[PDB]
Design a protein around this ligand. Structure first.
Ligand SMILES: O=c1ccn([C@@H]2O[C@H](COP(=O)(O)OP(=O)(O)O)[C@@H](O)[C@H]2O)c(=O)[nH]1
Ligand SMILES: O=c1ccn([C@@H]2O[C@H](COP(=O)(O)OP(=O)(O)O)[C@@H](O)[C@H]2O)c(=O)[nH]1
Ligand code: NA
Lengths: 291, 291
């Protein structure tokens, strides 16, 4: 049981210039649907009632997407576009949405800290979903919530990636529990060489964090500019005997962080859509047989 | 010889809801570059010195895209990201851009009519580029200008589409000239059944229009709700003996009007981009051979 999910959405998306000069990265469509909607939908399916979106001053339009649009709805109703009407009603009815402002892009720990004013006394634990990761099928947070129910404390997420390929990620130092997909976390190493990787478990952008994380984020050594390393806040909770576990995702994943990975997501989803799939698959079938 | 290009961009992209509730269709990226920049570049490559973008009040932001971004530019300089800096300076430096408002989306003829106040004393001919078409590899307007230099009057654009796939388009009733890719236009049929199509030449969204089109757009019978169609204006000029020719494009084209056509564009470009091609091709080889 968490009721509040936090989405850190305050980057620029340099890798998507020049589009992200004018469009927030999180509003970019996967086929026809903004990435932020796909992440809100995952959060709702795992039981979120509220979504706190952390954004920069210039990207406040992310949240405006989740507000009703009576005029557009009326216009669409008047033209009998009932299918398109349902699509625009979906995000505003998923859950309650609020914005927290991160004044400057000081990193992920700082972003999470910026959400604390939006929490209530009922928020003993909060979900955190990074919008550049899609984790499929939906439900990693449900597996994580079961871990929290049995062990208390905080829960993280990993992908299983061979050591030869993991050096770009944070890698957990782990030991076994009674469940093979659930590991006790002793720590994390940033970007180990293959030979020094403590495991094949690479950190993924899903979190179920005890409310104690906020106090840990205030107690850690800030960075040069005021960057608060979420990883250091987790290490502090560990040192103070807070239970931290990880669930290993065994499904598919997509990385919306660069245009290449984004395009893979979009093709993957379009090919399953009966409106787009057949005609795109036939086109692709010929396109890739030629230069 | 034209210096002004008009881009009608005032539709809602219904086919891209729910994204187009918040993001103008014409700012959506093809790999990482907004559609509108690709169209602007085609215009500039045909010798346009000015872009008049016709848009709705809701979609004026398509304007800011073409403005300098000082703080963003300085940030990239400071980080030494010379290649990304060039990406964001490309659009503002392509050509002069201005905006004309279409208050309500009453059709393409009405949209073109909205750009008339932006014309100066030398705009005897104007280019029109529909932003949902890409004409590859090198556009077509330079070829159209040559036709206008030979014959006077106005020039249209067609794709060569088999009769059994042509029924979604306007189809020209034509006769031959000396040049196999230039036809004399006698008329245009809307959405003929295959067996009735007067040719395989489907109307494409490029035009080189004599200034006389604005008077034709004033004299044609408005629609049920005030919809002027460019079609009726062209037919009226033809009736009055205005010469109308069409150039048949034989190269490639993309349709950015729907999510399917848009992804085909993105995959086409990414496969030719060395940053994505080889790996994307293999990904695609596997992906299309499974549901
Ligand atoms: O809510 C957030 C999300 C990210 N970031 C930071 O902003 C950058 C993320 O940029 P993004 O994820 O948009 O990717 P880019 O394309 O800019 O590299 C990194 O420095 C993150 O630490 C942040 O401060 N707040
Ligand atoms: O500048 C323009 C461009 C289009 N339209 C009209 O708007 C509709 C098309 O909208 P759009 O091209 O965005 O496509 P959609 O996704 O809505 O079908 C057609 O009736 C066009 O004639 C318009 O009034 N002004
Ligand atoms: Na560019």
């Amino acid at each position: 049981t968490f009721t509040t999910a936090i989405v850190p959405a305050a980057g620029l998306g340099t890798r998507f210039l020049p589009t992200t000069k004018s469009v927030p990265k999180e509003l970019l469509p996967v086929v026809d649907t903004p990435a932020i909607e796909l992440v809100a939908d995952e959060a709702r399916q795992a039981g979120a009632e509220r979504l706190v979106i952390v954004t920069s001053p210039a990207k406040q339009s992310i949240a405006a997407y989740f507000r009703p649009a009576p005029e557009l709805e009326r216009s669409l109703e008047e033209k009998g576009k009932t299918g398109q009407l349902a699509k625009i009603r979906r995000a505003p009815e998923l859950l309650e949405v609020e914005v927290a402002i991160q004044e400057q892009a000081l990193g992920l720990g700082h972003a999470v800290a910026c959400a604390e004013p939006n929490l209530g006394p009922e928020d003993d634990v909060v979900a955190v979903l990074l919008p550049d990761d899609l984790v499929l099928p939906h439900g990693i947070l449900e597996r994580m919530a079961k871990v929290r129910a049995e062990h208390g404390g905080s829960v993280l997420c990993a992908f299983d990636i061979p050591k030869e390929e993991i050096s770009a990620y944070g890698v957990f130092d782990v030991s076994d529990t009674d469940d093979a997909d659930v590991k006790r976390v002793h720590g994390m190493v940033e970007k180990p060489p293959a030979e020094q990787a403590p495991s094949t478990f690479a950190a993924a952008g899903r979190y179920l964090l005890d409310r104690a994380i906020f106090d840990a984020l205030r107690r850690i050594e800030p960075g040069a500019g005021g960057e608060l390393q979420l990883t250091d806040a987790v290490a502090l909770l560990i040192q103070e005997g807070h239970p931290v576990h990880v669930v290993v995702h065994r499904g598919d994943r997509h990385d919306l962080g660069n245009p290449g990975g984004f395009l893979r997501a979009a093709v993957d989803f379009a090919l399953q859509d009966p409106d787009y799939g057949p005609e795109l698959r036939a086109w692709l079938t010929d396109r890739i047989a030629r230069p």
